[PDB]
Design a protein around this ligand. Structure first.
Ligand SMILES: [Cu+2]
Ligand SMILES: [Cu+2]
Ligand SMILES: [Cu+2]
Ligand SMILES: [Cu+2]
Ligand SMILES: [Cu+2]
Ligand SMILES: [Cu+2]
Ligand SMILES: [Cu+2]
Ligand SMILES: [Cu+2]
Ligand SMILES: [Cu+2]
Lengths: 275, 275, 275
């Protein structure tokens, strides 16, 4: 499979904060194309992201990132004068680094991992209104050499929803058996959830992939996750289990009974699927 | 101590789903011998389990397993036509594999670990009624060479109970000091808990046992656990601390005050115990 | 930086359990000097702590420790006759050990890690009243060679508070950029929280510091934590991000909106701070 190259490229992005139908709010790559979740931002350790944020909501809003290197001017908080007025723009800057030894001989871990960005100013100074209405999105930082997937699926447990949907309206994620599928799982709001996937499992380490014979991490198919936890992993879809309608859901019983579930549909190469 | 041999044996089991007193429901190895939790199923990586499930309840019920390899026909869900009608039988098939390198050079983790099985169809399509009334049990998959215990104790945090009991009616687990005791800890229902044992600790890795001088995992005596989390570990009972009445309990304060506690009784070789 | 020496020293401590203003209760090193949290107790693997506990409250109270080696006589519970009457004293004894191979060839993990002590008898037999009013404190056990910090900050999520404060009255932690800052994070009471720090991150292993090129643990800046979880980590303050008002807070939205937040103030060497 394809592996990430060395990082160290300065990359420019624009995000638009747009109103969506029914009082929702989303980040978008073009005006009028906001989605919930926001677009996935992917980079490799050592890259820099210059992200111009265009605020087309009616309230001051912001952009806050987990995991990455940013100074207080990109903190995304009113407290650090880091918000965006309606109709105005602002550039937020995310740096990353790769792991390495400090002068004093101790190791600095790298930025690589599964992270996320969200609003930190709509509703409350902690972004509670903005997050509730959909202002959140995934971030993937690769380490040089990390294995790369064919499909990326984002699951955000936001209160009692997946990606602001419940019911049967939760996203279905389609893949062909044998494809390298990468899940990114972020939680938001006021509740704790357990993420679970039928028919698949992963390693509870940085990448979700076994690192080698001396990797000692738990292999799991269920993970407790609270507001602003983020993790991710990669699976071979259908490995050892075949195609089919493979449920993903929150395993808290009343939550899944209230629609915190969807389908990971693994299909044969011709599109067929048992069911 | 005794270590697990190489796996790769096809093993046949029967489980009976029986009504228990007071509206409860349990899995059993013989009719009339259902227990809460259900019998512990233990196997070694590479084994296959053929489990004929006999449904002696008055409602369609099922058998769903975490961690192991199963196709959609053993998914245990109505959605995948994998339930058992009253008075009927069905065989569910669990495979396992050991870790190994794929053709594309990346590592497939093995099935080894602490897992569980439960109903996925009584009450709701997520098995909420079945789980509430006791349809759940432990699964242990060994890696070749794993150290084996002398005693196995199962603790299921099910809502505000341990193994569907509270009060002083929670299980007491007896061992002799120096015995290798293995705990299997599963959570179910609608709440998050913290498992804790007085006088003992363990490594937060696959086996709960330190793997070697380069094992880096946290050593802990408390663990947050949500619905369908499962983990396990092994301790030398009384190691560094001696015999006694050693509390295990949920460390959420209102929970332990409402009876989410029991006793790990470590005794001298002659049966004595301080207290 | 300075590294912990070999342990194996017997050390004597006295703690006073005192009433504090407004119905609170705290551990103190001198009468009249109780604090919430209680004083931080630090030791190195192999050390023994003899802690005389002086009970100056009006109710029987105790001292219970996580992680360390103690027999039932220092269990801290009424059940094991391990409480302290008003106006009376008692010595509790904590042992520790370093990792090592048992006669049967399997590894015993060491005591090193981030732990805590609290009352186990005020209010309920699980110390619910004592913990609520502030009877809790940090414990750090070093492994020989562990890197040592310049500043130690303790954050206890106790119900909907930090260190029994909310509002703007939560502790501010000051450091100079480049200082080795160590956080100790303990949770208590009835709720689950997610700890998060703006501008900083850490490794989810024993020490919170990357152990080396084969360290595989997740790098994170958010952690789910439930009652009596304890973890800790070390950061270079301002590393990659500079001085400033760096929020720490619970990331559960309603919690941070209800004041579960404070400031990690990183300043330049002359005391300046952006903001
Ligand atoms: Cu924040
Ligand atoms: Cu949930
Ligand atoms: Cu955040
Ligand atoms: Cu399910
Ligand atoms: Cu509990
Ligand atoms: Cu399940
Ligand atoms: Cu206790
Ligand atoms: Cu909180
Ligand atoms: Cu405790």
């Amino acid at each position: 499979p394809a592996a990430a190259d060395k990082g160290g490229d300065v990359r420019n992005l624009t995000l638009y904060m747009e109103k969506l139908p029914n009082g929702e709010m989303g980040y978008g790559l073009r005006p009028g194309e906001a989605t919930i979740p926001g677009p996935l931002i992917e980079l490799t350790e050592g890259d820099t992201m210059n992200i111009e944020v265009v605020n087309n909501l009616d309230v001051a809003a912001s952009l806050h990132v987990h995991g990455l290197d940013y100074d207080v001017a990109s903190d995304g908080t009113k407290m650090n004068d880091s918000v965006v007025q309606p109709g105005e723009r602002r550039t937020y800057v995310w740096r990353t680094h790769a792991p390495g030894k400090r002068h004093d001989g101790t190791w600095e871990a790298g930025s690589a991992g599964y992270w996320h960005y969200h609003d930190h100013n709509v509703g409350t100074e902690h972004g509670t209104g903005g997050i509730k209405k959909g202002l959140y999105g995934p971030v993937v930082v690769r380490r040089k050499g990390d294995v790369l997937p064919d499909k990326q699926f984002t699951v955000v447990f936001n209160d009692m929803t997946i990606n602001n949907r419940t019911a049967p309206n939760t996203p279905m994620f389609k893949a062909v058996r044998g494809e390298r599928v990468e899940f990114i799982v972020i939680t938001h709001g006021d509740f704790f959830h357990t993420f679970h996937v039928h028919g698949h499992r992963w390693v509870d380490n940085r990448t979700g992939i076994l690192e080698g014979p001396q990797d000692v991490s738990r292999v799991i198919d269920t993970k407790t996750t609270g507001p602003a936890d983020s993790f991710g992993f990669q699976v071979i879809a259908g490995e050892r289990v075949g195609a089919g309608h493979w449920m993903y859901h929150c395993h808290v019983q009343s939550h899944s009974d209230m629609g915190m579930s969807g389908v990971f549909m693994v299909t044969e190469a011709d599109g067929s699927v048992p069911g």
